Amino acid sequence: ASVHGTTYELLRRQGIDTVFGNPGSNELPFLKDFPEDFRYILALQEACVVGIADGYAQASRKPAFINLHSAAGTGNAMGALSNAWNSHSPLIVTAGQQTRAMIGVEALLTNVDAANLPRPLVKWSYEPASAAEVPHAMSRAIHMASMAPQGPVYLSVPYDDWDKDADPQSHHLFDRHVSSSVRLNDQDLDILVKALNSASNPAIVLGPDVDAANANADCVMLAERLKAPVWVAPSAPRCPFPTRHPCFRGLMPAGIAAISQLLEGHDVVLVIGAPVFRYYQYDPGQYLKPGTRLISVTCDPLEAARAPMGDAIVADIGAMASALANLVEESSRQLPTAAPEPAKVDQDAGRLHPETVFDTLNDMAPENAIYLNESTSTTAQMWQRLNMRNPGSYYFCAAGGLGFALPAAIGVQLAEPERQVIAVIGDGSANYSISALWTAAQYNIPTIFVIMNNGTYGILRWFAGVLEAENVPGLDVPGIDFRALAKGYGVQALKADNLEQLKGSLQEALSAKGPVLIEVSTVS
């Protein structure tokens, strides 16, 4: 058997049947004789390729396979990999390398010191020392990406390797099962449950790894058992809790003082599946107010190590959430009261307020809709106004790297064809991966794109105000016609200059058969 055949059988047996790519000469030998049982998803830009695979991996909760072209292709994908690292996305990234005979002279398309290129944004980077080693390296890549903490991995393969003969003993690779679904030992776990039962005013904080492990339901039960208010960790890449649940308290502000102030009065704080903490703005103060004890459960050793306070437990979030939810006593305390419904903002017949857009989406979108957010100046309003009952309903670039939501929305839609994906993207962020639109049109992926157009870098303007910075250039982005951009890539475009038009467009988009883009004129 050839390395080519052996490799595809490996992918197939490990449950991988989709290839997200942008091709090059180095990758032709691998793409040739493409298995009929495999699917290839072309994106025009590498940043788009990874974004789409990222959305697909996250929604499907399974590793995604990518094929890029040498250093140039890998390089273009770097920004996307930065997000994938933060969101623990299981991405197997392969890139074609020059033929071994030509690597020495550094011929054109040679990926120099290839393993080093994507570092430090991957848990594993590797180039095999021989063709026969390739299947085994691929097997390594598959399990490294899938083991906790999940993350992107990198593999470089010289194009001449694929036709070579593969080692017959590679058959042992096909059916390897690697598990990391583990939880705290019985003894220590009982001590933890003791502590939770004995707390007089517990609070719970959930991060994206809860949604990734589909432990949302288990967390809901745990909260109901402890009668505890629930928060989502700051800078949230996902949503791990029904946002209308009486326990839900909303998105924590990404500041040190702000968070210790919020947790004040809570004697024990259970953090599940989140870093402690993913702060953003400079907000000096106490990490925790005296009287508050923090206990962290995380799947990532790097997160437990760098937390500046509290105890940490490194385990699988799914197994841990399940264990706790089923072991804690039912507290007699009153169940928390659901937060009040957001106030209706005053809306004239002009440009729409971000609050109005969200309220309208909430009224018109299906109950099982999936939202992506890359509208940076309106994130807070988005969490308050969208009712998200189900898991996997929200995605936001995990490292703050723009260009994520647009291609990811296509990947997510591909992963969940029964759920309407609605991406809310700012006029600024939209340009980073605009060409992903073409993939949506080409593969009939009925994703809905809502472009929030206020002609500027909203968030940046705000920051410039709180720093008091004057004469800052490059904050404005006038002169972009997004309907023409969407026509450029074969996507139906609509405009919403006002509320009347916004409802009309939303109704039309929801009904349309293919992907639709709506340009909304929002206030500055």
Residues 272 and 315: their CA atoms lie apart, in Å, by 10
Please identify which residue in 1, 61, 102, 245 interacts with a copy of itself, judged by CB under 8 A: 102
Say which entry of a copy of itself, ligand TPP, Ca ion, none residue 378 contacts (CB below 5 to 8 A, set by partner kind).
ligand TPP
**CB nearer Mg ion, residue 125 or residue 453:** 125
Q: Give the three-state DSSP class for 44.
A: coil
Residue 438: in which H helix or E strand, if any?
A: helix 437-442
User: Please, which of residues 46-75 interact with a copy of itself by CB under 8 A?
Assistant: 46-47, 70-75
Residues 6+ apart with CB under 8 A from 511: none
Residues 6+ apart with CB under 8 A from 2: 162, 163, 164, 165, 166
What is the distance of C-alpha 407 from the center of its chain? 11
What is the 3 state secondary structure string of 70-88? HHHHHHHCHHHHHHHHHCC
Residues 312 and 305: their CA atoms lie apart, in Å, by 8
Q: By beta-carbon distance, which residue lies closest to ligand TPP? A: 426
Please identify which residue in 44, 460, 464, 480 interacts with ligand TPP, judged by CB under 6 A: 460
Structure tokens at 443: 């593969």
Tell me: does residue 118 bind ligand TPP (CB under 6 A).
no
Tell me: does residue 426 bind Ca ion (CB under 5 A).
yes
Q: Are 398 and 278 in contact (CB under 8 A)?
A: no
Which residues on neighbouring strands pair with residue 91, listed in sequence order?
64
Is 117 known as a binding-site position? yes
* Residue type (1 letter), 310: G
Look up tokens 């790297």; give the residue. 401
Say which entry of Ca ion, ligand TPP, a copy of itself, none residue 40 contacts (CB below 5 to 8 A, set by partner kind).
a copy of itself
- Which range touches ligand TPP (CB under 6 A), out of 86-94, 184-192, 344-352, 423-431? 423-431
Say which entry of ligand TPP, Mg ion, Ca ion, none residue 119 contacts (CB below 5 to 8 A, set by partner kind).
Mg ion
Please identify which residue in 10, 53, 155, 304 interacts with a copy of itself, judged by CB under 8 A: 304
Is 497 known as a binding-site position? no
Closest separation in Å from C-beta 460 to Ca ion: 9
Please identify which residue in 23, 250, 310, 446 interacts with ligand TPP, judged by CB under 6 A: 23
Say which entry of ligand TPP, a copy of itself, Ca ion, none residue 487 contacts (CB below 5 to 8 A, set by partner kind).
a copy of itself
Q: By beta-carbon distance, which residue lies closest to Mg ion? A: 119
Say which entry of Ca ion, a copy of itself, ligand TPP, none residue 29 contacts (CB below 5 to 8 A, set by partner kind).
a copy of itself
**CB nearer ligand TPP, residue 235 or residue 505:** 235
Say which entry of Ca ion, Mg ion, ligand TPP, none residue 460 contacts (CB below 5 to 8 A, set by partner kind).
ligand TPP
Residues 523 and 384: their CA atoms lie apart, in Å, by 19
Closest separation in Å from C-beta 414 to ligand TPP: 22
Closest separation in Å from C-beta 469 to a copy of itself: 3
Residues 99 and 156: their CA atoms lie apart, in Å, by 11
The residue among 51, 70, 53, 80 whose CA lies nearest residue 117 is: 70
User: Please, which of residues 190-209 interact with a copy of itself by CB under 8 A?
Assistant: none
- Which range touches ligand TPP (CB under 6 A), out of 163-171, 249-257, 395-403, 441-449? 395-403
User: Please, which of residues 166-195 interact with ligand TPP by CB under 6 A?
Assistant: none
Please identify which residue in 279, 345, 443, 501 interacts with a copy of itself, judged by CB under 8 A: 279
Residues 92 and 79: their CA atoms lie apart, in Å, by 16
Q: Give the three-state DSSP class for 108.
A: coil
Tell me: does residue 96 bind ligand TPP (CB under 6 A).
no
User: Please, which of residues 458-487 interact with Ca ion by CB under 5 A?
Assistant: 458
- Which range touches a copy of itself (CB under 8 A), out of 10-18, 116-124, 263-271, 408-416? 116-124
Tell me: does residue 375 bind ligand TPP (CB under 6 A).
yes
Q: Are 437 and 449 in contact (CB under 8 A)?
A: yes
- Which range touches a copy of itself (CB under 8 A), out of 5-13, 52-60, 345-353, 456-464? 456-464
328: Cα within 13 Å, side-chain hemisphere = 29
Distance between first and last Cα of the chain: 62
Residue 363: in which H helix or E strand, if any?
A: helix 354-364
Using a 10 angstrom Cβ sphere, with 0-12 exposed, 13-18 middle and 19 or more buried, the burial of residue 460 is middle
Please identify which residue in 15, 17, 165, 182 interacts with a copy of itself, judged by CB under 8 A: 182
Q: Are 392 and 370 in contact (CB under 8 A)?
A: yes
Torsion of CA 456, 457, 461, 466, to 10 degrees: 160
Residues of the shown chain interacting with ligand TPP in the complex, contacts defined by CB under 6 A:
22-24, 46, 69, 72-73, 76, 79, 374-378, 400-403, 426-429, 432, 454, 456-460
Residues of the shown chain interacting with Ca ion in the complex, contacts defined by CB under 5 A:
426-428, 454, 458
Give the annotated binding-site residues for Mg(2+). 116-117, 119
